[PDB]
């Protein structure tokens, strides 16, 4: 096996050497540690066959970190191959030189990198730029000493527009890891030159060209208008990444754009068709498109005001896609499409996904809370969900009713009777606590509030800390409102939470309630059963500082995670 | 494979 | 008594299952998955004894397919291993060179042998020849 | 013949647009 | 008629999960279509396919009536298939076994032994509360039979009925009388198991079942004398199951009586020295004998022999042997506690063992071996184990350390320091239920509050993400704000507490995103109590309470509203309801 | 900015991996499978994984997961585009996307992966360009990649200059259970298979609403696509300037333009479903299909899928036109019709029993979807005006185009 392979590789037969190389490659791909045979393959490295040279280079790259000492016998071979007349051989040698993670290997490759920097072949130029970028990433000091920054900067204003895009991407990557000192920012002539070559760049070069404009900050309306006009044709590109980059560039330029000028209106009008096209992309890019829309939704919510039909979750859409669609609908919910949102939530509530049903219920509750015009519709939907005879659906409806009562309880007295007998046997803490709070605060439209609280008082001392606190608060409120039928209930609750309750916070609350009851029962109505102010709902919109930063970082991993770029990298 | 082997090898 | 005895392969496939405690189908599936994960996530020097859910989760597989037992903490741990070894020997004698492939094809025979050997999680046939003779007589009936 | 609509000849440009 | 082998081969031929699911669905559809026509020729193949699909993880709700129909059939193969279906897919919660009671009753009197035995096995495996009620008489009728092959089945059915219905054991008292002379090993084992189950269920039969102690001792002696036997002799131990049952009966028989222990003392002594633990069966027998001796009122020599055997098994390199020794030591913690102290080094070393079960057993033994003199010495070992323990054992180690401190703490100051160290190092591993216990312990202790208050203040400012530690610090601040800061009414010299850092910390905790609504409530209660407890920071917490009265949470919003109302309308009555809570055990 | 793109397998084995930056250890691939298994069992599985500080973005392929591990905040959209390009290149080179071709073309697969991207930045993405420099059965890189025209290889010579176009129409209707259509969008597809001599510059011209309005002829039937995406060879400058679709046609089948706009017309096929399902006794399938399309157009291979009960068995079909077959694997009955002329009314009456034992858990109500496909039908009414084929040498081209109308997301919500 190993001995036979070594003997075959140490022979003068080309067919046997090729067979040995193929066997080694297959073993390496299958999960075989072929690094021990790297020194044997070092001698059989300078071969005329291009297939064997590629395999040898791949083995050296994959066996360079494992055996750095044995990699010292390939510097001469790399130097010889760097002057190969065939452009493919030169490109492969340049890629292998930058792909070898050797501290002492890149030092001797500086001369080949400098020689290949001025390569006339656009593929050779791109390979040299990639090797320079890799060397700078591995050793920034070595790249600075070699003076590759000047060569990279001059590559942008040269021919080979794909090579120019590769050099621009390499320079941006070097500056991305740089501490921002001596940045490669260009004047408007550089931006115009990049835009002129943008139409001649390939699909990969378009992203690199648009990335440079993402860091540039326009300072004049005419320059911003020209940039927007140039990026407008990029919105008609089949590449999803190119379209996303163009949208991000347009959003960044809109920060300095003037709303009085018609350029902003034209950009907003042309952005909606792009968002609609992106919403119908592949499932892998669907999440990215949804995240980009959500990030740009907080910036220009009027761009997608009429984009509501496409926000509906399809039957074959994935769980992540359905969640993103529901989030977009919740963020894009409006009174104009309130009926459509309610119908989608009702339709989405009939699915078999428990998480999907909970998300739909939460979205319906958020829409009902945000828009008071659909408060009656939200209450009716919650009542229908409760009557649907679903444990999760019933719990979601109870939670929504409790949230609405704390937010809009002025006209919530018509659901107390319906919610009084609504399969209250559920032991879910979120639903039980919400029902207890609703009964305590709304203990006016129900004549059996004490009877209903009697069943929940059987295990008050061992139900839960939050549940026990809610039950005690409800009992105190009932005693303050109607103490004739709850005089004994209040005393029993105080005894259970004061003597049989070992919770520190619960014990303190019970002691405070007992002291208030024994000091001034009349004052307890104005102290305990007081009119609370308007509840300040938590705003889902991100901070303006984060929104501006997220606008520049469009299409990155941070946009999908909804986190700052420095808060997600390691 | 590993399935045709005897459980106890007896 | 043995709460549940299930034979699971190394890859996670279950070749046998016999629970003496009435549990929900979803709960039983979750318990089986947890037992497989614990056995699949346990080394060979763990003593073959796991105290999961207050149950003597004893895992001892002599081949690629492993076996798991769940008994209460009221008897010696070696008794479960001895019972498992005796059952494996009885199954091998009844079948002859028992392998993973034969277990899948003989699932009904294995279930019948397990029922005739241990009922309700307790030992029913202390001898090894009497149980084999009874199984052979039952099979010959038709 | 071919399913999904038979192939038809296409012009070079709009002759009525000059 | 698709054969079971063909279905198994088809299932094995599928690689993708979707393809296997589709094949299973097609097979289930074919089985349902065949069953809908009332097929009875290929019913065995359909039943086998349905059982295979159910075992693979496929629904079998529709394949319930077919099993019931096949149960009441006459074919032996069909009857076996129905019994297997009832045992596997039929349960008490299924509700489809109610109609199976008539079939079981009809087959209970069947002349064929395989049918009757299969029905008895199915009834034992799927014993129900109502099935046993209507089948208790049938089980008792077969308990008096002389069939050796059916005596074990009858005993198993009676044991299952007793376990399912403890009130039905009164009818088995005279059925098992005079049944200790069975020559068959299976019948004797079944009788011993039934007697042990009856003794464990209720203690009324212990006196009646204790009269057969000499018979059991004689049977055990005869079994030990016959060390060689073609049947039941595995690994050099003849009737290991019978020996284990006899040892268990001896341990459970006369556990609180001297006559029972004295009668079985000679048998236990002979077994402890006439048995070789080279094999697994011998080791299990020795462990069972040691457990029976420890759990019974045995002699000093028997206890010494059991301790020596446990110590010898502790040094065994086998993981199973080490686990058995650890379990025996843990069981013999209260009994022979002084003799268990000689294995302190072994218990300490077991915590560092590379076995999860072995490590857990060693930790449990160390926790149970903590006394009033080694508690201080073992505190450092427990802290080291908790600091360098596994994620699943760090919480358990912290709980054990807290329990030892609360039960056998050498001093309140030492116990308080240990609790504070556990809270600081436990972090998120401290149980939320232990927070009320720590609060009660702090409230009960009224002599160490200044140092404890200072430690809580120091630990709260450094970090606040620990829910249990944060809650404990908030409770301590609320209880002893008047003692944490002395002379903080106005500007004074720079001290640890300045009357403003505590308020800022409480506000940050209340407004911090790291709140679960329980620590926030405790912080709000502490802030409200500090209005009367602390007279230095006044007129500032009222604004926070008023602003905090509009919280998103209904309970938090109500609490904030109540606090604001009390501050704005009951300023003079704020101190009338801020009395210290009573301290009780 | 993925650190290394690798191809996994259904069992978690990596079929082939190729590191591009070296900042991510190759051992992180093993932990990807347990993370995916945990996410699937808890519903948190996503295509973009996260293993600590390194994100392992994966794409569900035909047989293996194309896991592209990344370390820094690389372009997620760029990574997805690179993965899609790699998948397209593999599909073009290998007709099968499975483990059979993964381990069969490793020698050429490694070379293709190395040439495609370097240092995490893709460089080559043209299938023809990649095949012209890397083959499985090497010369210098072609000048097409270096040249501006990377989508039209020069020097191509053919005996005849014939281009086959395809006017693909996708009719998607989102009809809710109430009977109203919610999402009714029709997406156009102008795909032409150009096979000629040289590198002609196609001059696309159709009856566009915007073009008709600009030219002053906005009075006839013009297609107004809400979203129009040009191909790679299509020049966006001409389209932005005066809607001039001028670009070099590719060598082979390619997508030039793809219209996408909402549809406000009645559905081509009107399907109404009746569920006379008894309580564990029987089930009724009152499915009636009405052809809303023109009578001159016939929907060939119309298959209206009606989801039957999951546990339903012994079903009986009573229809008038079209064979009805119940597939146990699909758990539904599809009203397959070979030819469906416009205006046809097909009524079906399904009848099947149900098991006595009720189901333990609900199975949901999947929407009913039809597979109608009527070719030679232009529902949008957009007619191609001319195709400006111009070559430097000068030749007479004979382009051809066919209009195909099919059903896309035409799902009707169940009752």
From Swiss-Prot, chain A:
Identify residues that carry 3'-nitrotyrosine.
561
> One GO molecular function term?
protein kinase binding
Keywords for the protein's UniProt record, in alphabetical order: Acetylation, Cytoplasmic vesicle, Deafness, Disease variant, Golgi apparatus, Ichthyosis, Membrane, Nitration, Protein transport, Transport
Offer one example of a GO biological process linked to this entry.
heart development
Tissue specificity note: Widely expressed.
| Entry's family note | Belongs to the adaptor complexes large subunit family.
**Function field:** Subunit of clathrin-associated adaptor protein complex 1 that plays a role in protein sorting in the late-Golgi/trans-Golgi network (TGN) and/or endosomes. The AP complexes mediate both the recruitment of clathrin to membranes and the recognition of sorting signals within the cytosolic tails of transmembrane cargo molecules.
What is the protein named?
Answer: AP-1 complex subunit beta-1
Organism name: Homo sapiens (Human)
UniProtKB/Swiss-Prot annotation, chain D:
Record PTM text: (Microbial infection) Polyubiquitinated in a post ER compartment by interaction with human herpesvirus 8 MIR1 protein. This targets the protein for rapid degradation via the ubiquitin system.
Family according to the record: Belongs to the MHC class I family.
Source organism: Homo sapiens (Human)
What name goes with this protein? Answer: HLA class I histocompatibility antigen, A alpha chain
Specify where the region named Disordered lies, as residue ranges. Answer: 2-18
Q: Which gene encodes it?
A: HLA-A
Stretches with biased composition (Low complexity):
9-18
Q: Which domain of life is it from?
A: Eukaryota
According to the record, mutating residue 1 to V results in: Allele A*80:01
Domain comment from the record reads as follows: The alpha-1 domain is a structural part of the peptide-binding cleft.
Q: What is the lineage of its organism?
A: Eukaryota, Metazoa, Chordata, Craniata, Vertebrata
Q: Where in the cell is it found?
A: Cell membrane; Endoplasmic reticulum membrane
Its annotated function is as follows: Antigen-presenting major histocompatibility complex class I (MHCI) molecule. In complex with B2M/beta 2 microglobulin displays primarily viral and tumor-derived peptides on antigen-presenting cells for recognition by alpha-beta T cell receptor (TCR) on HLA-A-restricted CD8-positive T cells, guiding antigen-specific T cell immune response to eliminate infected or transformed cells. May also present self-peptides derived from the signal sequence of secreted or membrane proteins, although T cells specific for these peptides are usually inactivated to prevent autoreactivity.
Please state which portion of the whole protein this structure contains, as first and last residue out of the total length: 338 to 355 of 365
What are the inducing conditions? Up-regulated by IFNG, and pro-inflammatory cytokines IL1B and TNF.
PTM-bearing positions, type Phosphotyrosine: 7
Residues bearing PTM Phosphoserine? 6, 12-13, 15
Tissue-level expression: Ubiquitous.
From Swiss-Prot, chain E:
Q: Where in the cell is it found?
A: Golgi apparatus; Cytoplasmic vesicle, Clathrin-coated vesicle membrane; Cytoplasm; Cytoplasm, Perinuclear region
Q: Name one GO biological process term.
A: platelet dense granule organization
Q: Which GO terms describe its cellular component?
A: AP-1 adaptor complex; clathrin-coated pit; clathrin-coated vesicle; early endosome; lysosomal membrane; perinuclear region of cytoplasm; presynapse; trans-Golgi network
- Superkingdom to which the source organism belongs: Eukaryota
Tissue distribution of the protein: Widely expressed.
Keywords in alphabetical order: Coated pit, Cytoplasm, Cytoplasmic vesicle, Golgi apparatus, Membrane, Protein transport, Transport
What membrane topology does this protein have?
Peripheral membrane protein
Name the job this protein performs: Subunit of clathrin-associated adaptor protein complex 1 that plays a role in protein sorting in the late-Golgi/trans-Golgi network (TGN) and/or endosomes. The AP complexes mediate both the recruitment of clathrin to membranes and the recognition of sorting signals within the cytosolic tails of transmembrane cargo molecules.
State the family named in the UniProt similarity comment for this chain: Belongs to the adaptor complexes large subunit family.
- The molecule here is called AP-1 complex subunit gamma-1
Q: Which organism is it from?
A: Mus musculus (Mouse)
The gene designation is Ap1g1
Which section of the whole protein is represented? 4 to 588 of 822
From Swiss-Prot, chain F:
The residue ranges of the MHD domain are: 160-413
Where does this polypeptide localize?
Golgi apparatus; Cytoplasmic vesicle, Clathrin-coated vesicle membrane
Origin: domain of life: Eukaryota
Mention any Pfam family matching this sequence.
Adap_comp_sub
* UniProt topology in membrane: Peripheral membrane protein
Question: GO biological process: any one?
Answer: endosome to melanosome transport
- Please give the CDD domains that the UniProt record associates with this protein: AP-1_Mu1A_Cterm, AP1_Mu_N
PROSITE patterns for this protein: CLAT_ADAPTOR_M_1, CLAT_ADAPTOR_M_2, MHD
Q: Which residues carry this modification: Phosphothreonine?
A: 144, 146, 215
- Modification after translation (UniProt): Phosphorylation of membrane-bound AP1M1/AP1M2 increases its affinity for sorting signals.
Keywords carried by this UniProt record: Acetylation, Cytoplasmic vesicle, Golgi apparatus, Membrane, Phosphoprotein, Protein transport, Transport
At which residues is N-acetylserine found? 1
Gene3D superfamilies according to UniProt:
3.30.450.60, Mu homology domain, subdomain B (2.60.40.1170)
GO CC terms on record?
Answer: AP-1 adaptor complex; cytosol; early endosome; lysosomal membrane; synapse; trans-Golgi network; trans-Golgi network membrane
Where does this protein chiefly localize?
Answer: Golgi
Q: Which family, according to the similarity comment?
A: Belongs to the adaptor complexes medium subunit family.
Quaternary structure and partners: Adaptor protein complex 1 (AP-1) is a heterotetramer composed of two large adaptins (gamma-type subunit AP1G1 and beta-type subunit AP1B1), a medium adaptin (mu-type subunit AP1M1 or AP1M2) and a small adaptin (sigma-type subunit AP1S1 or AP1S2 or AP1S3). Interacts with MARCHF11.
Protein's name in the database: AP-1 complex subunit mu-1
What organism does this protein naturally occur in? Mus musculus
| Name of the gene encoding the protein in the UniProt record | Ap1m1
């Amino acid at each position: 096996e190993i001995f036979e392979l070594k003997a075959e590789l140490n022979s003068d037969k080309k067919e046997k050497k090729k067979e040995a190389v193929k066997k080694v490659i297959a073993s390496m791909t299958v999960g075989k540690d072929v690094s021990a045979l790297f020194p044997d393959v070092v001698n059989c490295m300078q071969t005329d066959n291009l297939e064997l040279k590629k395999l040898v280079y791949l083995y050296l790259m994959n066996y360079a970190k494992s055996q750095p000492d044995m990699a010292i016998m390939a510097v001469n071979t790399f130097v010889k191959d760097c002057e190969d007349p065939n452009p493919l051989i030169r490109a492969l040698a340049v890629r292998t030189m930058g792909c070898i993670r050797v501290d002492k290997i890149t030092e001797y490759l500086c001369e080949p990198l400098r020689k290949c920097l001025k390569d006339e072949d656009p593929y050779v130029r791109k390979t040299a730029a990639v090797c320079v970028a890799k060397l700078h990433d591995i050793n920034a000091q070595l790249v600075e000493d070699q003076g590759f920054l000047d060569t990279l900067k001059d590559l942008i204003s040269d021919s080979n527009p794909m090579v120019v895009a590769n050099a621009v991407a390499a320079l941006s990557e070097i500056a991305e890891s740089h501490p921002s000192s001596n940045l490669l920012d260009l004047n408007p002539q550089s931006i115009n030159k990049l835009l002129t070559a943008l139409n001649e760049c390939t699909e990969w070069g378009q992203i690199f060209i648009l990335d440079c404009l993402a860091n540039y900050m326009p300072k004049d309306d005419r320059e911003a208008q020209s940039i927007c006009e140039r990026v407008t044709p990029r919105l008609s590109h089949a590449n999803s990444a190119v379209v996303l980059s163009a949208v991000k560039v347009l959003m960044k330029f809109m920060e300095m754009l003037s709303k009085d000028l018609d350029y902003y209106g034209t950009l907003l009008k042309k952005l909606a068709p792009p968002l609609v096209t992106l919403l119908s992309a592949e499932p892998e890019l669907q999440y990215v498109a949804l995240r980009n829309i959500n990030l740009i939704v907080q910036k220009r919510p009027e761009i997608l005001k009429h984009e509501m039909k496409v926000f509906f979750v399809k039957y074959n859409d994935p769980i992540y896609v359905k969640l993103e669609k529901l989030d977009i609908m919740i963020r894009l919910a409006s009174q104009a499409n309130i009926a459509q949102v309610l119908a989608e939530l009702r339709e989405y509530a009939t699915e078999v996904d428990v998480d999907f049903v909970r998300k739909a219920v939460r979205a319906i509750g958020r829409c009902a809370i945000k828009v008071e015009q659909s408060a009656e519709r939200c209450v009716s939907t919650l009542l229908d969900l409760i009557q649907t005879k679903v444990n999760y659906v019933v719990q979601e409806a109870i939670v929504v009713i409790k949230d609405i009562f704390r937010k809009y309880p002025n006209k919530y007295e018509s659901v107390i009777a319906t919610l009084c007998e609504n399969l209250d046997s559920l032991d879910e803490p979120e639903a039980r606590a919400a029902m207890i709070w609703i009964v305590g605060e709304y203990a006016e439209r129900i004549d059996n509030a004490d009877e209903l609280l009697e069943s929940f008082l059987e295990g008050f001392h061992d139900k839960s800390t939050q549940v026990q606190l809610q039950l005690l608060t409800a009992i105190v409120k009932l005693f303050l409102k109607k103490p004739t039928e709850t005089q004994e209930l209040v005393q029993q609750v105080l005894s259970l939470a004061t003597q049989d309750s070992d919770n520190p916070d619960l014990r303190d609350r019970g002691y405070i309630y007992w002291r208030l009851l024994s000091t001034d029962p009349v004052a307890a109505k104005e102290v305990v059963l007081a009119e609370k102010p308007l509840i300040s709902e938590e705003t889902d919109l991100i901070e303006p500082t984060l929104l501006d930063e997220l606008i520049c970082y469009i299409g990155t991993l941070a946009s999908v995670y909804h986190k700052p770029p420095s808060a997600f990298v390691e | 494979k590993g399935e045709n082997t005897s459980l106890l090898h007896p | 008594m043995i709460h549940f005895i299930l034979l699971f392969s190394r890859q996670g496939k279950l070749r046998l299952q016999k629970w003496y405690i009435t549990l929900p189908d979803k709960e039983r599936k979750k318990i089986t998955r947890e037992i497989v994960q614990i056995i699949l996530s346990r080394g060979h020097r763990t003593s073959s004894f796991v105290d999961w859910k207050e149950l003597k989760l004893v895992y001892k597989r002599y081949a690629s397919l492993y076996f798991c037992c769940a008994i209460e903490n009221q008897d010696n741990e070696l008794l479960t291993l001895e019972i498992v070894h005796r059952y494996v020997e009885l199954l091998d004698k009844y079948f002859g060179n028992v392998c993973e492939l034969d277990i899948i094809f003989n699932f009904e025979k294995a279930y019948f042998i397990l029922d005739e050997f241990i009922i309700g999680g307790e030992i029913q046939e202390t001898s090894k020849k009497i149980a084999v003779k009874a199984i052979e007589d039952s099979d010959m009936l038709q | 013949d071919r399913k999904g609509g038979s192939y038809s000849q296409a012009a070079g440009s709009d002759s009525a647009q000059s | 008629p698709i054969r079971l082998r063909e279905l198994i081969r088809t299932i094995r031929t599928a690689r993708t999960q979707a393809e296997e699911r589709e094949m299973i669905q097609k097979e289930c559809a074919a089985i349902r279509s065949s069953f809908r026509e009332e097929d009875n020729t290929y019913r065995c193949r359909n039943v086998a396919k349905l059982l295979y699909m159910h075992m693979l993880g496929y629904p079998a709700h529709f394949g319930q009536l077919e099993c019931l129909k096949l149960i009441a059939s006459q074919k032996f193969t069909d009857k076996r298939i129905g019994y297997l279906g009832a045992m596997l897919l039929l349960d008490e919660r299924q509700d489809v076994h109610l109609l199976m009671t008539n079939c079981i009753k009809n087959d209970l009197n069947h002349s064929t032994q395989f049918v009757q035995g299969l029905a008895l096995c199915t009834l034992g495996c799927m014993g129900s509360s109502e099935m046993c009620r209507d089948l208790a008489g049938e089980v008792e009728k077969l308990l008096k039979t002389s069939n050796s092959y059916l005596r074990k089945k009858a005993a198993l059915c009676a044991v299952h009925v007793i376990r399912k219905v403890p009130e039905l054991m009164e009818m088995f008292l005279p059925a098992t009388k005079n049944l200790l002379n069975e020559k068959n090993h299976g019948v004797l084992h079944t009788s011993v198991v039934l007697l042990t189950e009856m003794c464990e269920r209720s203690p009324d039969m212990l006196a009646h079942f204790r009269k057969l102690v000499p018979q059991l001792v004689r049977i055990l002696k005869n079994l030990i004398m016959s060390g060689y036997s073609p049947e039941h002799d595995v690994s050099g131990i003849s009737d290991p199951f019978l020996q284990v049952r006899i040892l268990r009966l001896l341990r459970i028989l006369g556990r609180n009586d001297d006559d029972s222990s004295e009668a079985m003392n000679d048998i236990l002594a002979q077994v402890a020295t006439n048995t070789e633990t080279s094999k697994n069966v011998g080791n299990a027998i020795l462990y069972e004998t040691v457990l029976t001796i420890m759990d019974i009122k045995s002699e000093s020599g028997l206890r010494v022999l059991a301790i020596n055997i446990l110590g010898r098994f502790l040094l065994n390199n086998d993981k199973n042997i080490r686990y058995v020794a650890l379990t025996s030591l843990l069981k013999t913690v209260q009994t022979d506690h002084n003799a268990v102290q000689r294995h302190r080094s072994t218990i300490v070393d077991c915590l560092k063992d590379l076995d999860v079960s072995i490590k857990r057993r060693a930790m449990e033994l160390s926790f149970a071996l903590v006394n009033g003199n080694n508690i201080r010495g073992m505190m450092k070992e427990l802290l080291y184990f908790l600091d360098s323990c596994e994620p699943e054992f760090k919480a358990d180690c912290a709980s054990g350390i807290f329990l030892a401190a609360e039960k056998y703490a050498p001093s309140k100051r030492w116990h308080i320091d240990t609790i504070m160290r556990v809270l600081t190092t436990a972090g998120s591993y401290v149980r939320d239920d232990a927070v009320p216990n720590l609060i009660q312990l702090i409230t009960n202790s009224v002599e160490m509050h200044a140092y404890t208050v200072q430690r809580l203040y120091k630990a709260i400012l450094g970090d606040y993400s620990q829910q249990p530690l944060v809650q404990v610090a908030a409770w301590c601040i609320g209880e002893y704000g008047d003692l944490l800061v002395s002379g903080q009414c106005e500007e004074e010299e720079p001290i640890q507490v300045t009357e403003d850092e505590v308020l800022d910390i409480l506000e940050s905790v209340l407004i911090s995103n790291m709140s679960t609504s329980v620590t926030r409530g405790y912080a709000l209660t502490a802030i409200m109590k500090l209005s009367t407890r602390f007279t230095c920071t006044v007129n500032r917490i009222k604004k926070v309470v008023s602003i905090y009265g509009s919280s998103i949470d209904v309970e938090l919003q109500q609490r904030a509203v109540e606090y604001n109302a009390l501050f704005k309308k009951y300023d003079h009555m704020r101190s009338a309801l801020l009395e210290r809570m009573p301290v009780m055990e | 900015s993925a650190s290394a793109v690798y191809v996994l397998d259904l069992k978690g084995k990596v079929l082939i991996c190729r590191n591009y930056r070296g900042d991510v250890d190759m051992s992180e691939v093993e932990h990807f499978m347990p993370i995916l298994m945990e996410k699937e069992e808890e519903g948190m599985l996503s295509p973009i994984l996260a293993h600590g500080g390194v994100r392992f973005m994966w794409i569900k392929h035909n047989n293996l997961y194309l896991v592209a591990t990344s370390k820094k905040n690389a372009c997620v959209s760029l990574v997805f585009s690179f993965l899609y390009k790699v998948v397209q290149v593999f599909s073009e080179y290998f007709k099968e996307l499975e483990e059979e071709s993964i381990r069969d073309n490793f020698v050429i697969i490694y070379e293709l992966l190395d040439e495609l991207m370097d240092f995490g930045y893709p460089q080559t993405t043209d299938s023809k360009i990649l095949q012209e420099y890397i083959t499985q059965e090497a010369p210098r890189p072609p000048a097409t990649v270096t040249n501006a025209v990377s989508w039209r290889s020069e020097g191509i010579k053919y005996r005849k200059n014939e281009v086959f176009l395809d006017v693909i129409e996708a009719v998607n209707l989102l009809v809710s259970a109430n009977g109203n259509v919610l999402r009714s969008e029709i997406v156009g597809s102008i795909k032409m298979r150009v096979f000629l001599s040289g590198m002609p510059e196609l001059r696309l011209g159709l009856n566009d609403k915007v073009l008709f309005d600009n030219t002053g002829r906005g009075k006839s039937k013009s297609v107004e696509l809400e979203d129009v995406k040009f191909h790679q060879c299509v020049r966006l400058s001409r389209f932005e300037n005066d809607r001039t679709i001028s670009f070099i046609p590719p060598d082979g089948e390619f997508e030039l333009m793809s219209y996408r706009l909402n549809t406000h017309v009645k559905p081509l096929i009107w399907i109404e479903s009746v569920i006379e399902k008894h309580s564990h006794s029987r089930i009724e399938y009152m499915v009636k299909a009405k052809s809303q399309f023109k009578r001159r157009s016939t929907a060939n291979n119309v298959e209206i899928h009606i989801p039957v009960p999951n546990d339903a068995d012994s079903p009986k079909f009573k229809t008038t036109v079209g064979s009805v077959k119940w597939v146990p694997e699909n758990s539904e009955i599809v009203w397959s019709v070979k030819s469906f002329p416009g205006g046809k009314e097909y009524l079906m009456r399904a009848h099947f029993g149900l098991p006595s034992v009720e189901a333990e858990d609900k199975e949901g109500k999947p929407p009913i979807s039809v597979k109608f496909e009527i070719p030679y039908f232009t529902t949008s009414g957009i007619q191609v005006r001319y195709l400006k084929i111009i070559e430097k040498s000068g030749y007479q081209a004979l382009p051809w185009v066919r209009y195909i109308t099919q059903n896309g997301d035409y799902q009707l919500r169940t009752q």
